[PDB]
Amino acid sequence: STRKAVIGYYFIPTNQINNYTETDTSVVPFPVSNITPAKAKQLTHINFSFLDINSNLECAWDPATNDAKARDVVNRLTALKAHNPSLRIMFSIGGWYYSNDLGVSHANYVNAVKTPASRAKFAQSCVRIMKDYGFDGVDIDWEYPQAAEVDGFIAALQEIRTLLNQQTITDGRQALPYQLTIAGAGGAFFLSRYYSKLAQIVAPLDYINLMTYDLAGPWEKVTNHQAALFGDAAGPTFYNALREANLGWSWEELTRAFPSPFSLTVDAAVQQHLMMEGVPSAKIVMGVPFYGRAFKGVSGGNGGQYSSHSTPGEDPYPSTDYWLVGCEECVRDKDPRIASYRQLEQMLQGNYGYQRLWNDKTKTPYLYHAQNGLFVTYDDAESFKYKAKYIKQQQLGGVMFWHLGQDNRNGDLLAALDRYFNAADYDDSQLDMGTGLRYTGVGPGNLPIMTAPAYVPGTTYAQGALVSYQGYVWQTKWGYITSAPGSDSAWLKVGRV
């Protein structure tokens, strides 16, 4: 079996690069030296983040970056390749801060993909930056191009692919080609922006890393799991934005591919991607979070799940009240709404009042502070057993995560992921995926194999008539159909032969 990708983000703020040190945790919490040889071997990719697209419409580091210190940090990462011949140090362009619709550099993203000339100049800058700093690939994290910017985004990706494939030949990297990936939406709302052209977006990529997290948060009215694998009927449900994408499909087609409302889960994002033709499962990578989201002012009854709350949803945290008991990291980061798994693990074992609970439908853990009314949704080594089994069962390309500095000091989360995919003595054949809700949509990309008597010319077909014909099973949408399946909108293609 081909090894599953394990893609971890290495994120460092500009000021940390400008004051990089591997000997003062109060200045650089997570220096490159914390990525021991053992951890380097459990990773296949490290996404260095984040670079941006400047006003000159080229890939570039934050202008305030001390270049020499930046190269030194990157060199330290590249040196880890000594312990793992498959390791690739990618760099990520974008991220929410720089590129969301209201982010500071949004216009640059829109403008860089606008014309053949802007695209050429942009694609060149990505490869140049890649070669100059010694990176092994380009990862684009634009959150997210809108419907009109999509064809341009696609041309940009194709252009970068062309240049990278050329660079691979020029550098003798046939054995470890340069790669191209993007962080893709892991939720229908953002996904609906480019969904209709998913095949063209994925074609030039080695992997599309789904951000299947942040699926719940203080901006929503009711608390919920931010990365549930499957759905919980007792949990909130959402409008399936995909049924409104510019697909050109019929009512029937739209309805059967996009049930609404539905459970916003990791399984939903993966299955929605697999519903489209030309989106190979092997390129789909499941993103997981090494952090949890916290809410205050929750009620009792369901251990804090599906409750109203009083947590501010704006960025930055519009207050100075650090109410996440025991979360020291939250005080230094001035935000009690997010906490690394490292910090959560310490809070859990420090007698702070948290009770760890488990939702066996969503297959994810959660914390409930009954005394203060706090709820935290997060992921751990146990939820990763199911996600890892799903990744194997669905034949996905692998896993991705944000971010390395949030794992505990022993790197247990990374180690668990590596174990679930590669340990010869780990056996998950008896691991039960449970009865949580699965995404029920069916599209052109995942039609099931079926059998039905073959269409007989001359027969009058009633409503709901199933006849195999031309390599597909077709069903009539209404009665008195006497036409051949395929050239009358009265027929619905429902299966493969």
Ligand X SMILES: CC1=[NH+][C@H]2[C@@H](O1)O[C@H](CO)[C@@H](O)[C@@H]2O
Ligand Y SMILES: CC(=O)N[C@@H]1[C@@H](O)[C@H](O[C@@H]2O[C@H](CO)[C@@H](O)[C@H](O)[C@H]2NC(C)=O)[C@@H](CO)O[C@H]1O
Q: Which residues are catalytic?
A: 143
Which stretches of 153-251 are assigned E, i.e. beta strand? 179-185, 207-211
Tell me: does residue 96 bind ligand Y (CB under 6 A). Answer: yes
> Which residues does 401 contact at the CB level (< 8 Å), separation at least 6?
7, 8, 9, 287, 288, 289, 290, 413, 414, 417
The window from 54-62, 91-99, 296-304, 418-426 that contacts ligand X (CB under 6 A) reads: 91-99
Does the footprint of ligand X cover residue 335 (CB under 6 A)?
Answer: no
Measured from the Cβ of residue 268, the count of other Cβ atoms closer than 10 Å reads: 30
Q: How far is the CB of 496 from ligand X (least distance, A)?
A: 35
Assess whether the previous peptide bond of 403 is cis (omega < 30° from 0): yes
Give yes or no for residue 96 binding ligand X (CB under 6 A).
Answer: yes
Q: What are phi and psi of 395, to 5 degrees?
A: 55, 45
Q: Give the 3-state secondary structure of residue 116.
A: helix
Q: In this chain, which of 8, 31, 95, 365 binds ligand X, going by CB under 6 A? A: 95
Is residue 137 involved in binding ligand Y (CB under 6 A)? Answer: no
What's the CA gap between 341 and 319, in Å, rounded?
A: 23
Q: Name the phi and psi angles at 391, rounded to 5.
A: -60, -35
- For residue 338, how many other CB atoms are within 10 A of its CB? 23
Using the minimum distance from each CB to ligand X, give the nearer residue, 97 or 478: 97
Interacting residue with ligand Y among 84, 114, 190, 492 (CB under 6 A): 190
Strands (E), 403-477: 466-469, 472-476
Choosing from 31, 103, 187, 398, the residue that interacts with ligand Y (CB under 6 A) is 187
CB 151 within 8 A of CB 61: no
Minimum distance between the CB of residue 58 and ligand Y, rounded to whole angstroms? 24
Bridge pairing between strands 59-60 and 45-53: antiparallel
By CB under 6 A, residue 141 contacts ligand X:
yes
* Candidate ranges 90-98, 106-114, 301-309, 327-335; the one touching ligand X (CB under 6 A): 90-98
Residue 402 partner contact from ligand X, ligand Y, none using kind-dependent CB cut-offs of 5 to 8 Å: ligand X
Q: Quick one: which segment of 92-100, 113-121, 240-248, 311-319 binds ligand X (CB under 6 A)?
A: 92-100
Q: Report what 359 binds from ligand Y, ligand X, none; CB cut-off 5-8 Å by kind.
A: none
Q: Which residues bind to ligand Y, rule: CB under 6 A? A: 96, 187, 189-190, 214-215, 217, 219, 313-315
Question: Site residues (CB under 6 A) for ligand X?
Answer: 9, 49, 92, 95-96, 141, 183, 211, 214, 402
